[PDB]
C-alpha cells in the first residue's frame, strides 16, 4: 500500500 | 527448467497473454523462463518481470498478513484451537519465501551483466524489495542480515541514480520511494523515510519543467505516491 | 493424496483460514482432503468445498475467455503471430477440464452416499454445473455428451428439488438458477431458460409468506438473481 | 455472470 504498486 | 523448450520470443509473447488473462502465477513461469535463456532483457522485459513476481508476491505477502494477525489473536483469553493456524502460516511464509529466492535469477546473472543505470538501478531495487519481503517475515538469527542486504541492494542503486540519471526519472522516484517504505517499515528510521521522501519530491518538483507532457505525467504519478506517503508520515 | 496424513478436523479447519487469506487453489486442495477421508460432508463442509472449487474454477474460466478472445481476434486481416495464443489457450483449457474433472469427487463417492435432499440436490447441482462449464470450452465430438451429463444431473436435481424442498428453498433456487442458466447459454434454449426462471420466480413468491425474517432474506437473494437474469433476456 | 455467485 505504501511501496510502489 | 520446464521451460528450456519454449523460444525466448515465444516466452514473451505468452507472458503478455498471461498478463492480460490475470495469470500471474504462468507470467512469472514465463519471465523466468525468458531469463534462463541468458540474454540481457529489455526494458519492456524488464517491467513484465517485475510485474509478474510483484503480482505473485503480492499474493502470498496479503495472505501472510491475514493469516499472521490470526495467529497474533490466537496467542492473547483466546481458546485454543491447536498447531493448525501456525502450521498453514509458515506454509505460505515458506512458500513466498521460496518466490523470494527465486526472484537467484538476478544473482545468476541479471545484476552482473546490468551495465546501463536504468537496467542496472532496476534490478538493484528488485534487490532490495525481494530482500524487504524476506525481512517482513523474517524472525530469527538472520533478521538483521536479510535487512543489510536490502538496505545493501537500495543503497547501491540509489547511487548509481544520483549520478546517472535526472531527479524526475521513473526508475529513480519508485526506487527512492521504496527505500523510503524500507527505512519507515522494516528499518525503524521513520525520520529517514520522511527526509528521503521529501527531497525526493522537492527534487522532482524543480525538474518537471525540462519534461514534456507525457513524461510530466509519468514523474508526477509517482511524486503523488510520495506525497501521499509524507501525508501519512506527518 | 498429500493431505492423507491430516487430520479430517484440521483440513476443514486450514479451509477456512484459506478462505480468509483467499488462497482458494489450497483451500480445494484442503476441502479434496476431507472428502477424500471417506466421511459425509455436513451443510457446512458441503458449501466450503463448492466455494473452494468455485473460485478456482471461476479464474481458469475468465481467463480462458480472455485467451479464447484473443484467439479468435487472431483468426480474422489479422497477421500471423504462431502457434503460441493456441498453445496458451489450450495450456488454461486443459488445466480448467482437470480441475472439472477432479470436482470425480462427486462420483467417488459424494453422490451415492447423498441421501437427504439437501445433500443429494447440492451435489447433482455441482454435477451439472462442472459438466457444464467442461461444455463451455467442448468442441470435439464429445461436446453433445457432455451437454448431456449436465442436462441429466440437472434434472435430477430438479425432480428430487420440487419433491421435496419448498419453493423458496435456497439451493432450489441456486439450482433453478443454474439450469436457466444452462438452456440459456449452452443447450440454445431461450425460451426454456426464461420459462423456468420466472416459474420459479413466481413459485418463490408465492411461498415467501411462510418465511423467517432471515430465510426471507436468503430467498429474496436468490430470487432477485432471477429476475436480474430475466430482465436482461426480455 | 448469469450464474449463481
Ligand atoms: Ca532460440
Ligand atoms: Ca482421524
Ligand atoms: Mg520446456
Ligand atoms: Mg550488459
Ligand atoms: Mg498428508
Ligand atoms: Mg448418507
Known amino acids: 500500500k505504501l511501496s510502489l504498486q | 527448467g520446464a521451460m528450456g523448450s519454449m523460444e525466448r520470443a515465444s516466452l514473451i509473447q505468452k507472458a503478455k497473454l498471461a498478463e492480460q488473462a490475470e495469470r500471474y502465477e504462468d507470467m512469472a513461469a514465463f519471465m523466468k523462463g525468458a531469463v534462463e535463456k541468458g540474454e540481457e532483457l529489455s526494458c519492456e522485459e524488464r517491467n513484465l518481470l517485475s510485474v509478474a513476481y510483484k503480482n505473485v508476491v503480492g499474493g502470498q505477502r496479503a495472505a501472510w498478513r491475514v493469516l499472521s494477525s490470526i495467529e497474533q489473536k490466537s496467542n492473547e483469553g483466546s481458546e485454543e484451537k491447536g498447531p493448525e493456524v501456525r502450521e498453514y502460516r509458515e506454509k505460505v511464509e515458506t512458500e513466498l519465501q521460496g518466490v523470494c529466492d527465486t526472484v537467484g535469477l ?3 546473472h541479471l545484476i552482473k551483466e546490468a551495465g546501463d543505470a ?4 532496476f534490478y538493484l531495487k528488485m534487490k532490495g524489495d ?3 519481503y524476506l525481512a517482513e517475515v523474517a524472525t530469527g538469527d538472520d533478521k538483521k ?5 536490502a538496505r545493501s541492494a537500495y543503497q547501491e542503486a540509489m547511487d548509481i541514480s544520483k549520478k546517472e540519471m535526472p531527479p524526475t526519472n521513473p526508475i529513480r522516484l519508485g526506487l527512492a520511494l521504496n527505500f523510503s517504505v524500507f ?3 522494516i528499518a525503524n528510521s521513520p525520520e529517514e523515510a520522511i527526509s528521503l521522501a521529501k527531497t525526493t519530491f522537492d527534487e522532482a518538483m524543480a525538474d518537471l ?3 514534456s507532457e ?3 505525467k509519468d514523474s508526477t504519478l509517482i511524486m503523488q505516491l510520495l506525497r501521499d506517503n509524507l501525508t501519512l508520515w506527518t
Open chain 2, 106 to 108: 538476478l544473482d545468476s
Open chain 2, 118 to 121: 536504468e537496467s542496472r538501478v
Open chain 2, 130 to 132: 525481494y530482500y524487504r
Open chain 2, 145 to 149: 542480515r536479510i535487512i543489510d542486504s
Open chain 2, 183 to 185: 527505512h519507515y517499515e
Open chain 2, 209 to 211: 519543467h525540462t519534461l
Open chain 2, 214 to 216: 507525457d513524461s510530466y
